């Protein structure tokens, strides 16, 4: 994934990962369900509700997306009116 760039010698990111996903600072990546805007006339309302949710992903996919992004995208953001602000830190975990 261009482990070493040809101008600065740094590591590059895949821009499709940035265009598809959102990384919470705890370590979780939020994605959209596949096909949530395709062929809606044949899907039942339960399936249409199930398609519209912001959904989490697996552990190995999260490690893949951490390897595909640099350290800039794993930082702490302090946006002014962030809707996902309450889900950045995590609470009441136990191993």
């Amino acid at each position: 994934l261009t482990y070493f760039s040809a101008r600065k010698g740094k590591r590059k990111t895949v821009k499709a990962v940035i265009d598809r996903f959102l990384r919470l600072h705890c370590g979780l990546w939020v994605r959209r369900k596949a096909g949530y805007k395709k062929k809606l006339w044949k899907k039942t309302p339960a399936r249409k509700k199930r398609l519209r949710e912001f959904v989490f992903c697996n552990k190995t996919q999260s490690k893949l997306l951490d390897k595909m992004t640099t350290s800039f995208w794993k930082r702490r953001n302090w946006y002014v009116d962030d809707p996902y602000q309450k889900y950045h830190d995590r609470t009441n975990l136990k191993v």
């Binding site: 499709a16 598809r20 959102l22 596949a34 949530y36 953001n77 302090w78 946006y79 002014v80």
Partner: protein, 148 residues
């Protein structure tokens, strides 16, 4: 290196390839999560617990006004003019047990934080700074060495 193949001979497909199958980072549709992130303003948080702590520990002093530069010279907050921090926001996290009687000038301030400062007999004023003025007022000494 294992037995012969792409493992032993080194040449393996790039990270994320799934053997010709459409990969996991491609089957998911796009959405504007990180759409305009390079132009959204960010504000570093500052609790009243932290402000009372700084006033207690001989750091930034209530006898003088409290702009950004007094907080930075106290190192109570570290502001980065790059990566789009438009100053420090005030926030209500240490409202109870806050007795300071100070005036302050911050860049954002919630209602309860303004209230909790004003009940001890102080002043809250909300100000704006541009990123060039952020870079000046955070570290004034390299700007004075700049000669502009």
């Amino acid at each position: 290196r294992g037995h012969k193949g792409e493992r032993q001979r080194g040449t393996r497909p790039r990270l994320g390839f799934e053997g010709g199958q459409t990969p996991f980072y491609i089957r998911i549709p796009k959405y504007g999560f990180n759409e305009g992130h390079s132009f959204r303003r960010q504000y570093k948080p500052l609790s009243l617990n932290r402000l009372q702590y700084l006033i207690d520990l001989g750091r930034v002093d209530p006898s003088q006004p409290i702009d950004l530069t007094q907080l930075v010279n106290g190192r109570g907050v570290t502001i980065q003019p790059l990566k789009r921090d438009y100053g420090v926001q005030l926030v209500e996290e240490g409202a109870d047990t806050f007795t300071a009687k100070v005036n302050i000038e911050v860049q954002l301030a919630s209602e309860l934080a303004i209230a909790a400062i004003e009940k001890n007999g102080g002043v809250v004023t909300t100000a704006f700074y541009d990123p060039r003025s952020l870079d000046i007022v955070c570290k004034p000494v390299p700007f004075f060495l700049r000669g502009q």
